[PDB]
Amino acid sequence: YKTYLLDYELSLLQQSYKEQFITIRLNGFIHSEQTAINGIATQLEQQLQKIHTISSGSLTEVFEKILLLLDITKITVVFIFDEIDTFAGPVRQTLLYNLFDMVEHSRVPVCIFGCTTKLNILEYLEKRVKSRFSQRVIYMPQIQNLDDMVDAVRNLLTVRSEISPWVSQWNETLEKELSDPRSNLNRHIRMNFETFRSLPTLKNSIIPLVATSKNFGSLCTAIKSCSFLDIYNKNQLSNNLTGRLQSLSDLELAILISAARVALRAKDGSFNFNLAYAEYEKMIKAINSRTIKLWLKKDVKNVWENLVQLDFFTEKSAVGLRDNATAAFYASNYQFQGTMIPFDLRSYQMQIILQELRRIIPKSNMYYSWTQL
């Protein structure tokens, strides 16, 4: 609740003092180093014409006009900076040095409200950038006890206005389930308090629970038994490593089991298609000796490529998704060694060890005897 508190303060002041300040919003992910200069001049020409050019020319002439403007009453230039940790680079903080200079030396009232996620934001600044700062770091409070989450949910589902005849009946049902700790609403709140402890996270399930109700009778039923809440929790954990194993056939499970035994008995866990086919072939002849159709080597290629797309076999010493866009361009122009070698000699890694496969497989399956080693 960082941007939500800042948006409420701007709306409260706009209902009385709408001609005394402007709104200048900035982002750390969208605006880069060079685009941050043009973003300030662009938001200034559109806000000055609304109360009663700047962003004209090259990049050098734009920054020159900004310093000549910021550096009966005045106009407060409220600066809303989002994700300020990206601009606090250890190489140079040009924008952070000029923004803080518009507070102490400059006479124009400039209110900078930075929003970041790093707890140690004081060390990310330079020696001169931190000198111009007032060291005003307001930490956002979190949920401590259990009664803090109950009062927040009650205030989000209580209609304090006479806009529907079912308002008086809905407030009695919500207050009855919340005051009783043995109800179903208090159980889901306590479960999310020790697992997530986030208000927007728990709000993702209350919204579809009310919209799916057809009438008032269906709303009071779903709010008392919480039947729809259990379905939402199962869907969120249906496409992970556990839900993907139940959607596999008999051959897709035999390949992943045989490939797990090779990486487990090895030293570094390296294996390829040739090592996985040797364990699968020795398992079919061992079971039938005590009829499973043994597939040829030309048919396992389609099953091997299907498990890679399903996030199960990761390449050995592979970075994968890059952080920023700089490392993503250099990695695309360089041809990796795994693309030149054939598919039967590519070193892969298992995303799940054999110890975890024995717990998510029931005893009714016939492939349970080959998961102990």
Partner: protein, 273 residues
């Protein structure tokens, strides 16, 4: 050469400094466009200052110097090249000897010969000429005039060399305790970081039970004083173990002779050294 934009465009500047502005201004690309202009002509003398910056910071680096050397070696033309670098067709190398004590003293009297009265002493210029062994001598003599005129000889030359153990006495007793633990962690662990130096300083002051400890957030404030004065150098390197990640390492740059002599005079700290 340093007052240019590109090192490859050095042939165009010579054309603008020789050809008249009333005639047609031609464009010069390289050697083929500059040699044909000096064919009909008149001794063209050029002074290329600081030729060491003409390289492209071995095959492609030595290109502008090798091209300009070949232009002033072939006959049929008349183009001389005199460069002033900084320390069978090879140029005549002349090493400029530095000025000594007797060489710097003659230039002072020769430069100030136009002045009617000389307020300098013959024994004061002899000390500044030997201690500076020409640009360094000018800053010494100029500093003595500004100092003497701000407070209102032989002692005037000694004050310019002293006004421009001291860094330790300018610190507090609390900053000396952390500094003593910084060099101590670098002796029993060689490469150490800021996180490892803070743990060694806390465990070293707990056995003595003197002075209150400080948090990790305020630990960087003391190290910042040593970096501004010139006693602790903090750089950014990597690790050498299994987790070779980017981390901030701490280092020093002081002598061990002066360190084991200033803190021992207070006679209040012994196990911290």
């Amino acid at each position: 050469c340093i007052s240019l934009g590109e090192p490859s465009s050095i042939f165009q500047k010579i054309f603008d400094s020789f050809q008249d502005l009333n005639g047609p201004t031609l464009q010069i690309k390289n050697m083929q466009h500059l040699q044909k202009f000096l064919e009909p002509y008149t001794t063209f003398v050029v002074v290329l200052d600081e030729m060491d910056r003409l390289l492209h910071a071995e095959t492609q680096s030595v290109r502008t110097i090798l091209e300009l050397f070949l232009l002033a070696k072939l006959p049929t033309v008349s183009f001389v090249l005199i460069g002033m670098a900084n320390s069978g067709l090879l140029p005549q190398t002349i090493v400029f000897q530095p000025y000594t004590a007797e060489q710097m003293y003659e230039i002072v009297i020769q430069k100030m010969s136009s002045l009617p009265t000389i307020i300098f002493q013959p024994m004061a210029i002899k000390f500044a000429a030997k201690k500076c062994a020409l640009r360094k001598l000018f800053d010494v003599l100029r500093g003595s005039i500004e100092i003497y005129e701000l407070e209102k000889g032989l002692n005037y030359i000694a004050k310019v060399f002293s006004k421009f153990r001291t860094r330790i006495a300018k610190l507090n007793i609390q900053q000396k305790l952390i500094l003593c633990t910084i060099i101590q962690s670098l002796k029993l662990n060689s490469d150490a970081t800021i996180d490892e130096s803070f743990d060694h300083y806390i465990k070293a002051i707990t056995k003595t039970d003197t002075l209150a400890p400080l948090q990790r957030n305020e630990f960087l404030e003391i190290c910042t004083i040593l970096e501004t004065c010139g006693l602790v150098s903090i750089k950014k390197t990597k690790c050498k173990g299994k987790t070779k990640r980017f981390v901030d390492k701490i280092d020093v740059d002081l002598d061990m002779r002066e360190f084991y002599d200033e803190m021992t005079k207070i006679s209040i700290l012994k196990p911290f050294l």
